[PDB]
Design a protein around this ligand. Structure first.
Ligand SMILES: C[C@H](N[C@@H](CCN[C@H](Cc1c[nH]cn1)C(=O)O)C(=O)O)C(=O)O
Ligand SMILES: [Cl-]
Ligand SMILES: [Zn+2]
Length: 507
């Protein structure tokens, strides 16, 4: 129960998905799990870049050479040392697979790494690049795995064990059931007060709620795909027990519909149909009624207050006459016979995908399905695992899906770069006729030093992307955490993908 977990210094969180592949040089694994065990050279905080595995660093005059002075007291979880050599091998191993990392521009600029002495490592770039430190602070890919865990000096095809430097170590993992993160008693920095944090896999909804009420789990938080295992009324019922508190971060992302311009066998490949769909999403009512006012509606992909945006570019409004008139233009007309829309003898249908673990995504899917039926479209909705949603996002096998932007450290520049990445939203943009010009504009934008000129370059990109109807913004997501009422020091970083497990502490 709760008491015993308090007494034993344990947290056990409920989640709908397993930790996956804990090699942090690739992206399949749980993000928060990996940030408990692996560490970057530096951290990107609300106060800027701060030391972590590197204590200090020098940038050359020309901006091409970063020299990192490493901590000398760090060990990997297997007992092997952390040093310049380990840094160079990790970065070389990531760079050996740089096609996977091309969403992050530094991976295209890294020339070589050199070891200067035992705790001094030089990183040489092809050109100067001021976001370098920021990109090195990300949770993947530039975090450090024991080189003894490499497979013949590589990580691109996996690692043999999952030894990092972080405040927790990976312990017993039973596939689709539980994973243990045990306190790293040799940790170099702020040691965990908790002995163990356990990720316990179970379906969302009633199972998760009961698990929590009885203290079999005693913690929850929005996973890395944005899914909250507990709905608003579960949260109410848990606060009401007296045992639990509920914290919610500042708004971190935009939650949107993705509309696959590249799906050639379906109507969503027609710009006009995409524009029509855009007027069929009542974001105001969804925010107020379906999401219980817990999120504000989103009228553009990246909110005005996001870095380098600072513009209002309101998207298509909810307007069914406008939708009708656009579907008629596209030749998807109803009939006196029926209210159902047809073209060339075929009915208008589309397949929408949502995470079956998200009650909010499911309710939205049901709503929209009802709303699309009024328009004479048959919207087939499919709840799947977030792992399956992601695979579909990469393959392009979908007409519409729920998704979300990547948060405060990624929006807008990384999320925009992902518009032309295979592992991001390239599927959805791949059917735009001016895609060659937009993709080139994306590359150009990142080279613009002046803030205002850059914001304008982003505006020109986003305007065309809005024109295309690729993304339909809906609401602004936060990170939500349920925790024991006597757990102190639960707080949020800039990321929606980690939590300070090693700082949390009972009573
Ligand atoms: C590289 C790219 N995305 C980044 C940041 C964005 N993460 C989210 C959330 C996520 C969860 N699991 C994998 N990505 C996303 O791609 O929507 C990363 O995974 O480190 C990717 O997933 O391949
Ligand atoms: Cl907005
Ligand atoms: Zn990702």
């Amino acid at each position: 129960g709760l008491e015993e977990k308090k007494e034993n210094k344990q947290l056990t969180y409920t989640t709908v998905k397993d930790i996956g592949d804990m090699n942090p040089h690739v992206y399949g694994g749980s993000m928060s799990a990996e940030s408990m065990i692996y560490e970057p050279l530096v951290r990107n905080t609300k106060d800027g870049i701060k030391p972590l595995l590197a204590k200090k660093w020098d940038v050359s005059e020309d901006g091409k050479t970063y020299t990192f002075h490493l901590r000398d007291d760090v060990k990997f979880h297997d007992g092997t040392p952390f040093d310049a050599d380990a840094v160079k091998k990790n970065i070389d191993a990531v760079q050996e697979n740089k096609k996977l990392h091309s969403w992050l521009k530094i991976s295209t600029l890294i020339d070589n790494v050199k070891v200067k002495d035992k705790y001094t490592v030089e990183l040489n770039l092809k050109e100067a690049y001021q976001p370098a430190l920021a990109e090195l602070a990300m949770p993947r890919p530039y975090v450090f795995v024991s080189p003894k865990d490499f497979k013949n000096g590589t990580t691109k095809d996996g690692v043999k064990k999952f030894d990092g430097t972080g405040p927790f170590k990976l312990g017993e993992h039973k596939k689709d059931e539980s994973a243990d993160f045990n306190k790293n008693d040799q940790y170099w920095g702020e040691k965990s007060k908790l002995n163990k944090v356990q990720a316990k896999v179970m379906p969302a909804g009633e199972t998760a709620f009961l698990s929590m009420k009885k203290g079999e789990t005693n913690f929850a938080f929005t996973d890395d795909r944005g899914t909250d295992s507990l709905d608003k009324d579960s949260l109410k019922q848990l606060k009401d027990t007296g045992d639990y508190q509920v914290k919610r971060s500042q708004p971190m992302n935009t939650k949107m519909l993705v509309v696959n311009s590249g799906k050639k066998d379906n109507a969503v490949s027609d710009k006009t149909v995409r524009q029509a769909i855009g007027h069929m999403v009542n974001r105001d009512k969804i925010a107020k009624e379906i999401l219980d006012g817990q999120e504000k509606p989103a009228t553009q992909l990246f909110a005005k207050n996001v870095t380098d945006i600072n513009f209002d570019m309101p998207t298509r409004k909810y307007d069914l006459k406008k939708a009708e008139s656009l579907l008629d233009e596209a030749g998807w007309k109803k009939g006196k016979d029926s209210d159902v829309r047809q073209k060339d003898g075929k009915n208008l249908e589309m397949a929408m995908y949502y995470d079956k673990g998200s009650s909010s995504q499911k309710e939205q899917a049901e709503y929209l399905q009802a709303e699309f039926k009024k328009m004479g479209i048959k919207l087939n909705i499919n709840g799947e695992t977030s792992d399956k949603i992601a695979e579909r996002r990469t393959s392009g096998d979908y007409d519409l899906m729920f998704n979300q932007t990547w948060g405060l450290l990624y929006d807008p520049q990384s999320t925009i770069a992902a518009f032309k990445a295979k592992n991001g939203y390239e599927s959805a943009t791949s059917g735009i006729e001016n895609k060659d010009k937009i993709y080139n504009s994306i590359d150009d934008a990142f080279k613009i030093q002046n803030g205002k000129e850059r914001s304008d370059a982003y505006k020109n990109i986003l305007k065309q992307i809005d024109d295309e109807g690729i993304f339909i913004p809906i609401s602004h997501g936060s990170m939500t955490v349920v925790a024991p009422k006597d757990l102190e020091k639960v707080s949020f970083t800039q990321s929606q993908y980690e939590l300070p497990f090693n700082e949390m502490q009972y009573k």
